[PDB]
Design a protein around this ligand. Structure first.
Ligand SMILES: Cn1nc(CO)c2ccccc21
Ligand SMILES: Cn1nc(CO)c2ccccc21
Ligand SMILES: Cn1nc(CO)c2ccccc21
Length: 147
């Protein structure tokens, strides 16, 4: 039926069908469109107190809760989807990953290099697509597949 990871669901608030991807946590109204040795991704990381390393270039001691991290991630996704902000702009300003200085770009990678949920989401994204919140031991990620 649908590309890897996609399923149909019903909006609680509207009653209209939508599509959700359980690998990437992406969700959208439109039916999803249409694997490579490597992908290229950018990400925005929000760390929390249970991150493997609760520290970043933004904050020496990261104290926010995982739930608070998820709310930040949700808010960034909303601004990216509305066009109010660009992913690259938000990553540069707010990613707790040092890749913030490269607008979140991580370069190209294969399977067997990244943390597993990150890898799975990255390879399930089509070129140009963005994930929903993806959880790893680093924190919570928004992932943008660029190649
Ligand atoms: C961890 N990481 N990975 C990349 C790849 O762009 C990068 C670039 C600048 C700073 C930190 C970085
Ligand atoms: C600048 N740069 N680039 C990469 C991966 O390409 C990387 C990984 C760890 C730290 C810095 C890094
Ligand atoms: C080893 N590894 N795994 C991930 C996935 O979060 C990651 C992100 C940035 C730099 C290195 C990284």
């Amino acid at each position: 039926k649908l590309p890897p990871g996609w399923e149909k669901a019903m909006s609680r608030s509207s009653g209209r069908v939508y599509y959700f991807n359980h690998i990437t946590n992406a969700s959208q109204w439109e039916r999803p469109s249409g694997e490579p040795a490597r992908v290229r991704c950018s990400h925005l990381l929000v760390k929390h107190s249970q991150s493997r390393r609760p520290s970043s270039w933004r904050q020496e001691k990261i104290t926010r809760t995982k739930e608070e991290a998820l709310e930040l991630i949700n808010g960034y996704i909303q601004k990216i989807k509305s066009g109010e902000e660009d992913f690259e702009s938000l990553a540069s300003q707010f990613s707790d990953c040092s890749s913030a200085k490269a607008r979140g770009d991580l370069g190209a990678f294969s399977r067997g290099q990244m943390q597993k949920p990150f890898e799975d989401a990255s390879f399930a994204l089509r070129t140009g697509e963005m994930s929903g919140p993806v959880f790893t031991d680093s924190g919570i990620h928004i992932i943008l597949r660029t190649e």
